[PDB]
Design a protein around this ligand. Structure first.
Ligand SMILES: *[C@@H]1O[C@H](CO[C@@H]2O[C@@H](C)[C@@H](O)[C@@H](O)[C@@H]2O)[C@@H](O)[C@H](O)[C@H]1NC(C)=O
Ligand SMILES: *[C@@H]1O[C@H](CO)[C@@H](O)[C@H](O)[C@H]1NC(C)=O
Length: 277
């Protein structure tokens, strides 16, 4: 495991400078650079922060060599590029990071779209957060085999969500899809969520939801649907207005009608005699 002795030795050969700050260590790569390629913040047996300043994926060869961080709970990556068509776990293995349960990936310099391969060997994760100001495509197989995942956060200006995104994922307790550009929610997306307690869909472009979309959320406790331009015309808002009125205790904040500004829960649609779902 990385400690005092490893930090002192790193400052001797001067490939990367190391300085112990508080109960943590700061690694600058390359040494004495005004704008370093890598700035690592390591707290042994707790967390690792990787601050990147890369122009292209080949800059990863400038990472500290033979570094053995060991077991940590959280890995935070900031401004880092997706390592081409190579898993993110390969960066983690090279730095000697062992079995992290939380991965945070935040970057405006991705260099490419995220794939299923980028998450290979990260099946053990319990918490995953992907953040970017860049418009990104979410493939249908992105979260396949992420069976230990209980907390998912995607803030990547996503417009569409694939229908089979949560296929075979059953341990999910929290889904944070707020502050994206979502115009639609596909029917059957929350069909197999027996443990889901929190769902955030606030600050998107949702005008409607398919009928029966939340009916299988048996463990649901909190839901965010505000800051969406909801179409409160009848019968379009019939299902959501009735559902929000019945589950009023679960709603966090207030979903409002694009026109009037009235809460969605206050709409009572008349009966025309048509078929319901
Ligand atoms: C990111 O993806 C954009 C859209 O990709 C399209 O959709 C996928 C499902 C495939 O069919 C692919 O062949 C299509 O191109 C691209 O337009 C965009 O260039 C990609 N971004 C980068 C940086 O490569
Ligand atoms: C990243 O490096 C460039 C020079 O390549 C520099 O202009 C920029 O300020 C650096 N970013 C930070 C956060 O220091």
């Amino acid at each position: 495991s990385f400690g005092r002795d490893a930090c002192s030795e790193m400052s001797i050969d001067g490939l990367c400078q190391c300085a112990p700050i508080m109960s943590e260590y700061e690694i600058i790569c390359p040494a004495n650079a005004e704008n370093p390629t890598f700035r690592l913040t390591i707290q042994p047996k707790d967390y690792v922060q990787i601050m990147c300043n890369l122009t292209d994926t080949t800059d990863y060869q400038q990472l500290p060599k033979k570094l053995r961080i060991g077991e940590v709970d959280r890995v935070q990556m900031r401004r880092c590029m997706l390592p081409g068509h190579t898993p993110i776990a390969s960066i983690l293995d090279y730095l000697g990071i062992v079995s992290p349960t939380t991965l945070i990936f935040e970057s405006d310099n991705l260099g490419m779209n995220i794939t299923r391969q980028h998450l290979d060997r990260l099946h053990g994760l319990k918490r995953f957060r992907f953040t970017t100001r860049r418009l990104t495509h979410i493939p249908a197989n992105l979260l396949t085999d992420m069976r230990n995942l209980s907390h998912l956060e995607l803030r990547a200006n996503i417009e569409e969500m694939p229908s089979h995104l949560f296929d075979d994922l059953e341990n999910l307790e929290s889904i944070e899809f707020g502050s994206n550009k979502l115009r639609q929610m596909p029917r059957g997306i929350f069909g197999k969520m027996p443990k889901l307690k929190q769902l955030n869909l606030a600050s998107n472009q949702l005008k409607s939801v398919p009928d029966g979309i939340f009916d299988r959320l048996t463990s649901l406790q909190k839901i965010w649907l505000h800051t969406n331009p909801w179409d409160c015309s009848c019968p379009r808002i019939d299902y959501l207005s009735r559902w929000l009125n019945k589950n009023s205790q679960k709603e966090q904040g207030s979903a409002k009608c694009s026109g009037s500004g009235k809460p969605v829960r206050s709409i009572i649609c008349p009966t025309t005699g048509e078929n319901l779902y």
